[PDB]
Amino acid sequence: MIWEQHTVTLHRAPGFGFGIAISGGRDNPHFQSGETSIVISDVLKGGPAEGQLQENDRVAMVNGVSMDNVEHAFAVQQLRKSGKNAKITIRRKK
Numbered sequence: 758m759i760w761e762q763h764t765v766t767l768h769r770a771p772g773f774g775f776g777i778a779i780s781g782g783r784d785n786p787h788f789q790s791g792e793t794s795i796v797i798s799d800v801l802k803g804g805p806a807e808g809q810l811q812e813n814d815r816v817a818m819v820n821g822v823s824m825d826n827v828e829h830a831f832a833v834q835q836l837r838k839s840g841k842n843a844k845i846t847i848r849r850k851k
Contacts, residue, residue: 760779760851762846764847764851767810768841768842769802769805769842769843773805773846774836776804776805776806777800777836778797778798779796779807779829779833781794781796781832782827782828782831784828793826793831794824795824796813798813799812810847811849812832814848816848819823819843819845821841822835
């Protein structure tokens, strides 16, 4: 494996949030391996993340806050408490 790490800034589109869904978390592992990583599970068509993130990107950080082995609701709450912008550091299996 290689992991490519990118950071993106998503601008809130009101009525549409940041146009992503997240899964995973240590209380909610997405993968059959039990890996606990927060992951992008859906990107809204036409929304703020279109062409910036894909399903299964691993989320390392949200607005500078580590998502290492955190609860699902902690990741959600970090997104929710973002301003106009959400800086999301991801890692992609390349």
